[model samples]
Target chain A: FLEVYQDSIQMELTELGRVAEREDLVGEEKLQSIFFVATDFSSNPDEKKFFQRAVFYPPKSLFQELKEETKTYEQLTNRILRETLEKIVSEEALVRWMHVFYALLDGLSVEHGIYDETEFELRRKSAWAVLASLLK
Target chain B: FLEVYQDSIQMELTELGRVAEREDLVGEEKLQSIFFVATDFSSNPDEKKFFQRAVFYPPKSLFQELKEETKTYEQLTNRILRETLEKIVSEEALVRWMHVFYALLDGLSVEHGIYDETEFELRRKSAWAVLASLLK
Candidate 1:
């Protein structure tokens, strides 16, 4: 059941990204907006860890914070990615995206506790990759 | 010069409330973690507008985005408040007492430059309350 729900959510996200990209949501502005909402909804351990490894490791300033925070590798990575996304996106799209994202998260929360760590991690990675691809 | 800067930055904000009060700096886990690297820099009009309004609106669903984006705000507020006391208070000390508040806005961006007039008007009452308090 969980796997089905996850797959369905991924499909919806992929579709949303495709549409946004087709409509020329190509730059930092559009990508960031999408990232903001998605990050809020999907941030979890593995995604955060991947972000720390890919992005934060290169920036000493950011890296130091990750070290000090002693966050699980995932937490630190997600934090960096979340911050980077915000820096790139516009406020308008962010607001809209977050509304939809939160509804999704809320639905998930009802079905699973807020700390459904494993599911959260999987979705987080999907969300990160979706936004990261747009950055390319 | 400081007075002028204060009038420009502090005035609009003072009416809203001290930085600590407005951003919920007090006892927040995230705020505490990022406090060190945050800096007080001159505010850009656009950044200021986005940030000031974001805090003023305080949407729950968008909390993650706000947290990520407002890093700059956190640093700036910390810097200003610290500088105000001439080191009487540590930067962390002041931020510990702050809260997050924001004005609600409606509408999407019509033109690239100006705020939507209708949205601005709708939020004007609350904005005034914020402005008046700061100017006082």
Candidate 2:
């Protein structure tokens, strides 16, 4: 687990989705990636919280409709997610991963202020406390 | 990924298949388990299919609701498979693991006539082969 900052990710997702409708901020998936990288404290300690925009955000899609449509969007997305989880991730600690992430996200968003980069980072220093508990 | 050995496995499962039908096997759920287990080939190798007999092969439920049914059998089974993969196993040369087992199983099953092991475990050795390719 890494350092903190965000709210209940789902809440932040939809709410920011509402705000994101107008502002120049990225999408929910982008924030999710940020929370993922920022809170990955145990994955690798030194390079964890380095933030970059294009690295975290994916590009939007435009359909070509060239080939015959074999699978729907929902089918393809769910299949991919389930496939990744089954082959790549450890099944046991998934929920704990979720917990530590939101906790840190909340820690950063509420306490350290997104705009306060220096304080934001310093507050992240405390995320190891929670991350240590979870990863341990 | 790994060496292929489909014939013996195919034959064994087919002959044993008739026995399973009478002994109260549901083929549908078993296929689901195959998907879960195969997709999980790259996950926590240590605890992969340790999912229960019930997790992989669910019991037949007859109800308009005799025991006050809360969930569909499918619902419960998938949740278990999903939960297991996210937490338990990945920590693989791993491919070389499969060719040895089924080759040995076929050797034993063909030579000793011990297909009488009742569980018909020899037949399922194809599982690892299938599992190996899928994980690859």
Candidate 3:
């Protein structure tokens, strides 16, 4: 349990570059929690077990087969915006940020046509216009 | 630094009802990020800071003055989601979850003429249609 908990925390902290790891995921039954949550998510027992092992004891095969990794579409779709902000954001500011991030996420996702590459980029810069009066 | 880092971890857990707290914001340096991220958001520092403080350090006044407690907006706005899936998400699955969550966030924010009364309810259901495709 101790090692698993430590391993779990390690997985999150080391991978913090990605935005999605920050959840209340620590505890003793961490492994059981993984299997249970994934239940009903996998369509059948064999397929479910396959995914469980791939996650808890993943082999190189899973990655090799996936070919194209999937991201919940909005996250992938929003990469343009995240990239637009990252070049300018310091490790300093992101540590203190959220609502604006949420606001932008909502703005772009609302289907007001933000999924278009150019439009998403335009709105990305608009974040600069809305929130940057103090820096420059 | 320890306290700041600790606070960063805390603000997120306490706000479990909302999903965007997933960022690593930790200190005053983070406050700057909020302002910068909020850029192009508002030109005046006072008004902009007002917005930031309203978001990050609400004096209970913002919610109190709302006459309608905003939790209704915040929570009802975010649902059709998960539970043990909390402790269980692979760093891999999280990347997927955010897109679906963001998709719903955008749908509600688009001002599709959806009134606040029905706004959260409508979006909560949006997630089911978009994300439920995967669960089944």
Candidate 4:
């Protein structure tokens, strides 16, 4: 199961590179494979146990560091995006890029298994709302 | 130049992995970085030409398979996020995750020498618009 999961994850990464090159994600349906693999990988008893003990409980030193870095990046990107969008407002392009960005995030989220179906949906809707507010 | 680029890419991958692991990104970011580094190592080109070629041509062949896989994963995550938000939406998480996803993409884009600030902004806005529409 681990091997299969690893192989699947590897395959998805390769596809992500391909899609990035095309710069056009028309009819692209395979993107969700990343999340599926992530969910499966994380669901493994050993993996879950390891995370529960190592990541969830105790000092949480490692997880805390990563979360900090991730947060920093998040701040940086938002600043850049906001400044750039203000300069050049293209509704169509904005929409298209959001699709691409979401696709990429979906893959990343799958890798982490951070959220379940219900949680994922909630985030998606919120993202949509944020986007709509921006466009308006 | 080749050495510099390789080293830089490797460093980025390492940093990304460390951050992902720390953050409990479920090892998703780390996995993506690993796949990226593996491809970069395998692909051949002089250092100077690397950026030129990457920006102009990019490494489509190497990443094509992975992109296909990501497409499916993207869809699944989107579905989950949408559903989750339907019950309990949170814009904060959406924005945070989007930032994380963009950081990875931005890092790769810079390495490829396709780091167009203008284009990046345009794409970001487009993505935001799409998300907004979904909310509507």
Best by TM-score: 4
Chain A TM-score of candidate 3 vs. true chain A: 0.27
**Residue by residue across B1-136, what tens digits does model 1's lDDT show?**
2233334454444532443454444333233323221211123555444543454333677666654544544466555544433333354433322211110111111111222445333333332232122212
lDDT (Cα, tens digit) per residue for candidate 3, span B1-136: 2233234334433344233343464322232222223222223434333333333234654444432332333343233123323444554444354343444344333322223435444434433333333332
Give DockQ: model 3.
0.08
Kindly report the fnat of each predicted structure, to 2 decimals. 0.00, 0.00, 0.17, 0.08
Q: Calculate model 4's interface RMSD in Å.
A: 11.0
**Which consecutive 10 residues in model 1 chain A have the weakest lDDT in total?**
A104-113
Best by lDDT: 4
lDDT of 2 by residue, B12-110 (tens): 233334333342433334333433333332243223222111222224462223212222333443343333333332312222222222222222222
Q: After superposition, how far is residue A78 of candidate 3 from its true place, in Å?
A: 24
DockQ of 1: 0.03
- Model 3 TM-score relative to the real fold: 0.23
After superposition, candidate 2 runs with Cα above 4 Å error: A1-32, A36-87, A114-116, A125-136, B1-136
lDDT (C-alpha) at residue B39 in model 1:
16
| DockQ scores for all predicted structures | 0.03, 0.01, 0.08, 0.05
The lDDT of each candidate is 0.36, 0.31, 0.34, 0.39
- The candidates' interface RMSDs, in order, read 15.8, 24.5, 15.2, 11.0
Which order, best to worst by TM-score?
4, 3, 1, 2
Better of 1 and 4 by TM-score: 4
Off by over 4 Å in 4: A1-10, A13-118, A121-136, B1-116, B134-136
DockQ-derived CAPRI band for the predicted complex in model 1: incorrect
- The C-alpha local distance difference test score for the whole of candidate 3 amounts to 0.34
Candidate 2: CAPRI quality band? incorrect
Which prediction has more favorable TM-score, 3 or 4? 4
